[PDB]
Tab-separated table of N, CA and C in Angstrom:
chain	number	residue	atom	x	y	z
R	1	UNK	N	-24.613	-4.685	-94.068
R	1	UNK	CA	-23.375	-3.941	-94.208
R	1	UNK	C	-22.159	-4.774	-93.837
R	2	UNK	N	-22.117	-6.065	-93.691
R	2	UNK	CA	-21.078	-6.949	-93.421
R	2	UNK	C	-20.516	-6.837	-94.609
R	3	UNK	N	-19.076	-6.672	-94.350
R	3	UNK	CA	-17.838	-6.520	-95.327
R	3	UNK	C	-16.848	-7.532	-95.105
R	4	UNK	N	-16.193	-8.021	-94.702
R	4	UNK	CA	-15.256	-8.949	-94.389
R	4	UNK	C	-15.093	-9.917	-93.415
R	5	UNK	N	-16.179	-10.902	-93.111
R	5	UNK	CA	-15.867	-11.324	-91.561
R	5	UNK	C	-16.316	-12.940	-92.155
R	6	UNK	N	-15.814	-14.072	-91.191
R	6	UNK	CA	-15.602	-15.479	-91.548
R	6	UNK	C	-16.077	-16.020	-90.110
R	7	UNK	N	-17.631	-16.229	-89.888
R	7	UNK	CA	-18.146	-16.561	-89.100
R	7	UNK	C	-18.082	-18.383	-88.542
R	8	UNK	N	-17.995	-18.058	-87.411
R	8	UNK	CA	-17.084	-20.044	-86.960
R	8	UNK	C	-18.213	-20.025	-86.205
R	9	UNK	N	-19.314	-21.186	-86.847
R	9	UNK	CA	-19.825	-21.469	-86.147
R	9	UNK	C	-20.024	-23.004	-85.810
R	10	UNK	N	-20.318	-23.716	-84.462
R	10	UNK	CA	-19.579	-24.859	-83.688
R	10	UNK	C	-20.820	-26.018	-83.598
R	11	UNK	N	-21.308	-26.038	-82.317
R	11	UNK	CA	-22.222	-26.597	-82.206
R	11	UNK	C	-23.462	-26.369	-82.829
R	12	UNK	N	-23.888	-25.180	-84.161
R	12	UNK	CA	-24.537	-26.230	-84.894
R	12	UNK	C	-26.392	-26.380	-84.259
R	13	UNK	N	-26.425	-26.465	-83.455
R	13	UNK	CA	-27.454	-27.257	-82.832
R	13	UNK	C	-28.653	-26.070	-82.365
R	14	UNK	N	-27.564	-25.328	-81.246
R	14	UNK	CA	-28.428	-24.180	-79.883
R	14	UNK	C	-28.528	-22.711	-80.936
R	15	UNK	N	-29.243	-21.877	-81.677
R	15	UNK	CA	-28.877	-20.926	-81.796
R	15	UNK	C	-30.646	-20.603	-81.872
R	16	UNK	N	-31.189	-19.720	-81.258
R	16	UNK	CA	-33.056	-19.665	-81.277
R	16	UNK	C	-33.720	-19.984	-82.103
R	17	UNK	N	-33.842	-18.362	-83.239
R	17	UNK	CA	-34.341	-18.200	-84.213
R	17	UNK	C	-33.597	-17.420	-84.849
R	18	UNK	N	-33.271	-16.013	-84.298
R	18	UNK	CA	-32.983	-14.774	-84.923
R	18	UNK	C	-31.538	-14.721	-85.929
R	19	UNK	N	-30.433	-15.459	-85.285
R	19	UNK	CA	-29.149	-15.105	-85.631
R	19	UNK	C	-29.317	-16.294	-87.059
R	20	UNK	N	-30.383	-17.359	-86.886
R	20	UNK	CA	-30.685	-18.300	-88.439
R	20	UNK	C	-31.078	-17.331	-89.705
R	21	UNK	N	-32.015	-16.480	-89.318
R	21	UNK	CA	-32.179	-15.534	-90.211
R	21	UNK	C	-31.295	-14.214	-90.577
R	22	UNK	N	-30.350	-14.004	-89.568
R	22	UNK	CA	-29.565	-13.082	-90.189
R	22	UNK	C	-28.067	-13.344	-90.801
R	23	UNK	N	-28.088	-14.727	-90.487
R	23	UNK	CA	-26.708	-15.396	-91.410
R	23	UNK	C	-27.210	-15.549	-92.277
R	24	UNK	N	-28.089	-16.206	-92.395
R	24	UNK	CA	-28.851	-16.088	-94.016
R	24	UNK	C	-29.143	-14.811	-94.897
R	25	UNK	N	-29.367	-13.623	-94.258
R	25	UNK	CA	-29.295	-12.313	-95.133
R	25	UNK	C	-27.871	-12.402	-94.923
R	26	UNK	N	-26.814	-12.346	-94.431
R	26	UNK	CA	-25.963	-12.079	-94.334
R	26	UNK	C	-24.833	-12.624	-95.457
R	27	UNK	N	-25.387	-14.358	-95.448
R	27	UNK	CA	-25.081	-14.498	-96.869
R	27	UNK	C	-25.605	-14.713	-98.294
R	28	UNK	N	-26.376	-14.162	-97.976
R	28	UNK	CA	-27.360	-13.011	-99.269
R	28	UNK	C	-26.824	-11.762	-98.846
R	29	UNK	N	-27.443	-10.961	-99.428
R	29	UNK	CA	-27.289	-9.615	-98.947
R	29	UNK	C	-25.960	-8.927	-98.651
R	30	UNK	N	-24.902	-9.280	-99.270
R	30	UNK	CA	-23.698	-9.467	-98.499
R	30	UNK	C	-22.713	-9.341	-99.686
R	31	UNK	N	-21.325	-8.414	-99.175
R	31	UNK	CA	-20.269	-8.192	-99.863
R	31	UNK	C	-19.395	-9.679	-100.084
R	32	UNK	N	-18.436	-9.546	-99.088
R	32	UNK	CA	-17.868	-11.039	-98.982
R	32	UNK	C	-17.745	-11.483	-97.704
R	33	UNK	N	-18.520	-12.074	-97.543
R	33	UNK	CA	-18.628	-12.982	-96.591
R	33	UNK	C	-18.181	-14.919	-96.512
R	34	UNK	N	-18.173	-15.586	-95.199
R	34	UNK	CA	-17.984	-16.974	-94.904
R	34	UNK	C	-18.752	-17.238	-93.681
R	35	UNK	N	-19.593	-18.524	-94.229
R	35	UNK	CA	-19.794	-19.062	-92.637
R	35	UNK	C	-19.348	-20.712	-92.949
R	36	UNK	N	-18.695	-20.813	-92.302
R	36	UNK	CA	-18.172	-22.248	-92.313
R	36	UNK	C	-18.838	-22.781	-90.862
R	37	UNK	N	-18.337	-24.250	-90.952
R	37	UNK	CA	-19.258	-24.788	-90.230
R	37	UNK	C	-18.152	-26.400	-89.802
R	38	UNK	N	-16.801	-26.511	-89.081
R	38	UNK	CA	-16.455	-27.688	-88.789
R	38	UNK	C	-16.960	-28.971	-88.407
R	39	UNK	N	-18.423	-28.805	-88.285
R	39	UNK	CA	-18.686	-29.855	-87.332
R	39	UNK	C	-20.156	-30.676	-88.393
R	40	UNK	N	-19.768	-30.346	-89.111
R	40	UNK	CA	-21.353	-30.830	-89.967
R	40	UNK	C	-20.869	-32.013	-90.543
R	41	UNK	N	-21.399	-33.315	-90.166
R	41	UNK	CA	-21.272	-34.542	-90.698
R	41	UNK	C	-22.702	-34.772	-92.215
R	42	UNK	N	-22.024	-35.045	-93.354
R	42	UNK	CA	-22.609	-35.086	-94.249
R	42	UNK	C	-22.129	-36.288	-95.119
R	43	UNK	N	-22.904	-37.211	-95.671
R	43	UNK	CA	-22.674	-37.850	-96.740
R	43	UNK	C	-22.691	-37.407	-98.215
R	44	UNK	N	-21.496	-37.605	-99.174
R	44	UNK	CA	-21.170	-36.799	-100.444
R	44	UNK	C	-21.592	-37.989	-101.437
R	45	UNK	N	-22.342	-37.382	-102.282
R	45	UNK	CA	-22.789	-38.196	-103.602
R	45	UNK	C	-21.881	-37.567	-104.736
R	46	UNK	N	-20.775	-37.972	-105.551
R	46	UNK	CA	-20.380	-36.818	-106.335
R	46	UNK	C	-20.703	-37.687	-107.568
R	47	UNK	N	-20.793	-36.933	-108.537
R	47	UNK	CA	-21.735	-36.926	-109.961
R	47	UNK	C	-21.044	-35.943	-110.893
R	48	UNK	N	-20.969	-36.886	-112.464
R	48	UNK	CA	-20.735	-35.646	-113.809
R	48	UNK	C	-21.669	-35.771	-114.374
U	1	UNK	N	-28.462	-31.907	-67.211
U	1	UNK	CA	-29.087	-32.814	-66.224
U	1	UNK	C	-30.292	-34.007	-67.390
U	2	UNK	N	-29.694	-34.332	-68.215
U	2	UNK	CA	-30.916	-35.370	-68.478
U	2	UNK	C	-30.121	-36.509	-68.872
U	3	UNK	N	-30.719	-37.549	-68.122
U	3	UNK	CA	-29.648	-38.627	-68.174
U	3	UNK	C	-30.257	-39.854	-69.343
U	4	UNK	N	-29.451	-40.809	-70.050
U	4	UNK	CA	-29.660	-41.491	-71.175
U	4	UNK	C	-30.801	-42.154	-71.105
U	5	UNK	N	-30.994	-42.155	-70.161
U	5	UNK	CA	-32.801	-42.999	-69.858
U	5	UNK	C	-33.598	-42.039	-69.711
U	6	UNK	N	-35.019	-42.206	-70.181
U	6	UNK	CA	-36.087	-41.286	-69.735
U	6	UNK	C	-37.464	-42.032	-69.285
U	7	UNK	N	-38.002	-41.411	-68.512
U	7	UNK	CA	-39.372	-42.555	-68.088
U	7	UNK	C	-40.413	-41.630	-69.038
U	8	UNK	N	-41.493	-42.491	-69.399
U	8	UNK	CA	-42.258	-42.562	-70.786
U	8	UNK	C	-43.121	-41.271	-70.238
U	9	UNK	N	-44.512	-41.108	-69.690
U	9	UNK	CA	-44.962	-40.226	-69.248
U	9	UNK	C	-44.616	-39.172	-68.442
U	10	UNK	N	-44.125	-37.809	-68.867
U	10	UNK	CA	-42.946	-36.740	-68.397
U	10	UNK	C	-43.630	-36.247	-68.020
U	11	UNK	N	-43.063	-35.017	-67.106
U	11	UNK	CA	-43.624	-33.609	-66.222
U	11	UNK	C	-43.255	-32.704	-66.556
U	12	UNK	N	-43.688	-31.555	-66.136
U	12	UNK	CA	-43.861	-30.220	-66.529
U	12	UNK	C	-43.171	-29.361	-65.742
U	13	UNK	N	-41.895	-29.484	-65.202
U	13	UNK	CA	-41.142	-28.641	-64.402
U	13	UNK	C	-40.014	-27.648	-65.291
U	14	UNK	N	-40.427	-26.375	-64.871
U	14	UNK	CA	-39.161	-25.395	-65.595
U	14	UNK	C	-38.105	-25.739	-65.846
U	15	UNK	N	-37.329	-27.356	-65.210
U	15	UNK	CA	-36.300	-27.872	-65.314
U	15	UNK	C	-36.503	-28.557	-66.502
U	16	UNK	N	-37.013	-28.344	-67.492
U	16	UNK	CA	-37.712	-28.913	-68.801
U	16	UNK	C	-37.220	-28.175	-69.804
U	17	UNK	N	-37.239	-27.097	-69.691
U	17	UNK	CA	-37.444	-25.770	-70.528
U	17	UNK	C	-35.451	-25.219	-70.396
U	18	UNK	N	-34.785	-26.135	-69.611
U	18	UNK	CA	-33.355	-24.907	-69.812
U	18	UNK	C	-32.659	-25.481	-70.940
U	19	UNK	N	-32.064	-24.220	-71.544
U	19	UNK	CA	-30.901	-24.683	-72.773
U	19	UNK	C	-31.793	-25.039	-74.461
U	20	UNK	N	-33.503	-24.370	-74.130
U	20	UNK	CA	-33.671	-24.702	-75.085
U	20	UNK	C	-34.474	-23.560	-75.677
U	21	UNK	N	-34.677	-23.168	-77.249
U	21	UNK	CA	-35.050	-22.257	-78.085
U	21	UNK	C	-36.702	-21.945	-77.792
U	22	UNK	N	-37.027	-20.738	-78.622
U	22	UNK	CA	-38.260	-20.468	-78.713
U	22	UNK	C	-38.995	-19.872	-77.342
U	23	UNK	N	-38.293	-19.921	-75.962
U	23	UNK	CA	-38.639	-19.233	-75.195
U	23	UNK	C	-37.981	-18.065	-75.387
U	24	UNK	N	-38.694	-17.312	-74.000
U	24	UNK	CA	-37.818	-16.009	-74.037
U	24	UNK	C	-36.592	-16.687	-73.062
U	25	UNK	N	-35.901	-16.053	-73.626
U	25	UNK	CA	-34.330	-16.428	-73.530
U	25	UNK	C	-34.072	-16.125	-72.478
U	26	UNK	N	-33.828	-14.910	-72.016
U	26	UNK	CA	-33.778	-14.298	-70.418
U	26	UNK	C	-34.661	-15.471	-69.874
U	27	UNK	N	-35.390	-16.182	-69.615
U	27	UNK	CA	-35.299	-17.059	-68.907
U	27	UNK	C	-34.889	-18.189	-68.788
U	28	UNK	N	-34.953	-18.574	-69.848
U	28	UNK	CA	-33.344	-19.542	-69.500
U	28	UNK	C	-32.180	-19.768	-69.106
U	29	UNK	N	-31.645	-18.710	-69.515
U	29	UNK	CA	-30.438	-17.478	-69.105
U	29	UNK	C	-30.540	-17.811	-67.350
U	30	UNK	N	-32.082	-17.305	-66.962
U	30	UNK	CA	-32.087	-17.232	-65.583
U	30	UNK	C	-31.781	-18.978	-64.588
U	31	UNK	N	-32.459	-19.575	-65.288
U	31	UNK	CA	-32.836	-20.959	-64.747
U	31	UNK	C	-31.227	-21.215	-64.460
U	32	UNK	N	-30.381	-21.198	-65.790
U	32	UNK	CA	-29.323	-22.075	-65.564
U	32	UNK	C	-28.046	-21.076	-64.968
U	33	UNK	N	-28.408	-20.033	-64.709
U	33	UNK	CA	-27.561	-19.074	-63.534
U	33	UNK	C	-28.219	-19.492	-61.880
U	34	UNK	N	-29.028	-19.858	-62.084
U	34	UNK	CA	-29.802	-20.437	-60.695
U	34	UNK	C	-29.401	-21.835	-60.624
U	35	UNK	N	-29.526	-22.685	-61.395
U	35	UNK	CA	-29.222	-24.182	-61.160
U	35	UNK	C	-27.642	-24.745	-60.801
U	36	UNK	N	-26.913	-24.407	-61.681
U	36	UNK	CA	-25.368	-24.390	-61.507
U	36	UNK	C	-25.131	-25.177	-60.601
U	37	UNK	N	-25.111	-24.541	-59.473
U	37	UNK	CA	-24.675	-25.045	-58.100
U	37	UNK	C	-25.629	-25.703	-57.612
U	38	UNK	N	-26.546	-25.944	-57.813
U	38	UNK	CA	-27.321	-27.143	-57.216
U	38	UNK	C	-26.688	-28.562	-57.725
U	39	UNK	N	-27.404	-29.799	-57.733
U	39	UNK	CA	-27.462	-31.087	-58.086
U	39	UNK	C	-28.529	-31.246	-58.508
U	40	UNK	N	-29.276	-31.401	-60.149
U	40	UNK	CA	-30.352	-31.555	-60.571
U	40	UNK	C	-29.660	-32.753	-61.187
U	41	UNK	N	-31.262	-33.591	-61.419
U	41	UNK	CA	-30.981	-35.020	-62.586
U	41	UNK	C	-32.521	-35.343	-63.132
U	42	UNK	N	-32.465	-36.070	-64.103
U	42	UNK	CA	-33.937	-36.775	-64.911
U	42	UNK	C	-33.464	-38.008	-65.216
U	43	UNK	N	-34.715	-38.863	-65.301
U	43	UNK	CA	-34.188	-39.862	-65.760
U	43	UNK	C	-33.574	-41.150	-64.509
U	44	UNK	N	-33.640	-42.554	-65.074
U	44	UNK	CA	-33.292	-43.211	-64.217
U	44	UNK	C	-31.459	-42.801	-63.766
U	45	UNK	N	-31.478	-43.111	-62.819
U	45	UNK	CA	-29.826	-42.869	-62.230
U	45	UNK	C	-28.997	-43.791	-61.835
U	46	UNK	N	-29.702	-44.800	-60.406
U	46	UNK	CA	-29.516	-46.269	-60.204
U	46	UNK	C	-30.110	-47.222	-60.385
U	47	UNK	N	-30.000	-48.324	-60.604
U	47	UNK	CA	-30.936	-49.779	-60.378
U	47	UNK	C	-29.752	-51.071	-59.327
U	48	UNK	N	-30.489	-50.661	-58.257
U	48	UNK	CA	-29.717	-51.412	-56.958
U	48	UNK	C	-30.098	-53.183	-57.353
């Protein structure tokens, strides 16, 4: 039933089990939602 | 409390187990409401 909310999440690292699986329904299952994520170091391959 | 060095063959003290997933949480919770104010460490510290 999440409707509008833009979840900040930080470190990334500490979270158990439970709240992995319900951001994930959350963005499934879900009106409009965001989870962004500042801290994720990633290397970009971009491709046409 | 775990410092950049570690000695190879480790122990089994509840001071093992804080800050990390897959336990029950309430006890971790507990450990590091108990530790706080102490002085805990792992790991080498000096070499005189």
């Amino acid at each position: 039933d999440i409707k509008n909310v833009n979840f900040q999440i930080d470190i990334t690292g500490i979270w158990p089990e439970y709240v992995i699986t319900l951001l994930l329904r959350a963005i499934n299952n879900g009106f409009n939602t965001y989870v962004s994520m500042p801290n994720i170091l990633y290397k970009p391959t971009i491709t046409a | 409390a775990i410092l950049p060095t570690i000695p190879t063959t480790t122990g089994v003290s509840p001071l093992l187990r804080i800050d990390t997933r897959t336990e029950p949480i309430w006890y971790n919770d507990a450990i590091k409401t108990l530790i706080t104010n102490l002085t805990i460490q792992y790991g080498k510290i000096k070499t005189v």
